[PDB]
Design a protein around this nucleic acid. Sequence first.
RNA 1: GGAUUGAAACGCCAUGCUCAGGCUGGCGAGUGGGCGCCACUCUCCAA
Length: 69
Amino acid sequence: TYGIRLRVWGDYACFTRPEMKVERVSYDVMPPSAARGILEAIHWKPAIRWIVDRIHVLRPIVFDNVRRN
RNA sequence: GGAUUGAAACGCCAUGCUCAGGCUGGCGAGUGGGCGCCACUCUCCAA
């Protein structure tokens, strides 16, 4: 009908929670705002809007720690 | 061609495991035992 299905994957990710920003801690899954951000990176013009509907999670949850200057 | 609580963000500069110490002193392969018993070169061939 209309709308699209897109797949994305990678090895690292960090969607920082607003209330633990100085010491970054990530959500368990990507919030809709990040999805908004990614789609606009392929094509976007001032004349249109993006509307997100769903997200599918296909892997288990894992965590790791890193420190930097 | 606005805005992924985002856009930028070195763990970095440098320091001897060093100085020295005996595997030593010493102890019998040593005591002793028959190669023995006995047996035909012997029968015949002109120079």
